[PDB]
Amino acid sequence: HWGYGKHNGPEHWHKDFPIAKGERQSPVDIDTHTAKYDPSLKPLSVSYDQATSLRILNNGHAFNVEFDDSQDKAVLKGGPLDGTYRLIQFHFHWGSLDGQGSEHTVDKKKYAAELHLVHWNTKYGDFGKAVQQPDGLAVLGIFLKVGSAKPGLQKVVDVLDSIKTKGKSADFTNFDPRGLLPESLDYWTYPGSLTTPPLLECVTWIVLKEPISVSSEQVLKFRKLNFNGEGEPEELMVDNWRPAQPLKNRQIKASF
């Protein structure tokens, strides 16, 4: 099965998912001198006051915080988006070391981790239908740098103990995604895909300029998770990041 090891790593995915070599693959390197300031791009609109977190799950490649997406409770609009995108889940990508973890890179600079807030276009009625469309998904990308602790993240840090191995889930209600957002909403956008199999090219990437800082110890607990199921040989959940893919003439636009 696909994973991040030498035998089932990103360099092998193409065999099972040929799209791996597609035209709008993610992630990419964000070259700051090359991105284009586009003045016709609107401010992002993040309405998360009504978000309904449900549970946290270890799915073997990361941990997903899942939300009730049966109604327009936590949504994203504006920016380069047309229509309403409902928040479904959020997860991270992190490294074995603080000098790596992020998927996206800024001027070839890698951050300690990358937060992904996954949203789906509501005119397609369900997540499953949306991944089949060019504009089915909106993914908010936030970088993590090691510094001071992030208040807002501790609730997550605390439950990781209960979902140590693959297939474990925990109740995780009343969690507010707002405590994960940076002050500024300045962004870069490009059309890309899912960063994990099936790597479908259904994403409008929205990558935030301003990183959020988290402490060493916060980051250390992510690294305690296991890719493996319970009663199996232990394999620490580390470096679950896909390297940068060719931009192939796509244009990266900037809101600033």
Ligand X SMILES: O=S([O-])[O-]
Closest to ligand X by CB, 171 or 208: 208
Contact flags string 104-123 toward Zn ion, x per CB under 5 A: ------------x-------
Q: Could you tell me the smallest distance in angstroms from the CB atom of residue 177 to ligand X?
A: 15
Cβ of residue 40: shortest distance to Zn ion, in angstroms? 28
- Closest CB to ligand X among residues 131, 214: 131
Instruction: For residue 166, state whether it binds Zn ion (rule: CB under 5 A).
Output: no
Question: Is 195 one of the binding residues for ligand X (CB under 6 A)?
Answer: yes
Q: How do strand 253-254 and strand 187-192 relate by DSSP bridges?
A: antiparallel
If you write DSSP's letter for every residue of 129-173 in order, what string do you get? HHTTSTTSEEEEEEEEEESS--GGGHHHHHHGGGG-STT-EEE--
CB of 37 to ligand X, least distance (A): 26
Given 7, 12, 33, 61, the catalytic residue: 61
14 is known as an active-site residue: no
Residue ranges for the known binding site for Zn(2+) are 91, 93, 116
**Strands 105-106 and 85-94, sheet pairing:** unpaired
197: exposed, middle or buried (Cβ count in 10 Å: 0-12, 13-18, 19+): middle
Nearest approach in angstroms of CB 27 to ligand X is 8
What is the C-alpha to C-alpha distance for residues 121 and 130, in angstroms, rounded to an integer?
Answer: 6
- Cβ contacts of 249 within 8 Å, gap of 6 or more: none
Residue 194 binds which entry of ligand X, Zn ion, none, CB below 5-8 Å type-dependent: ligand X
The backbone torsions φ and ψ at residue 149, rounded to the nearest 5 degrees and listed phi first, read -70, 155
Q: Which is nearer to Zn ion, 19 or 38 (CB)?
A: 19
Q: Which helix (H) or strand (E) holds 191?
A: strand 187-192
Decide if residue 194 touches ligand X (CB under 6 A). Answer: yes
Which positions are catalytic?
61
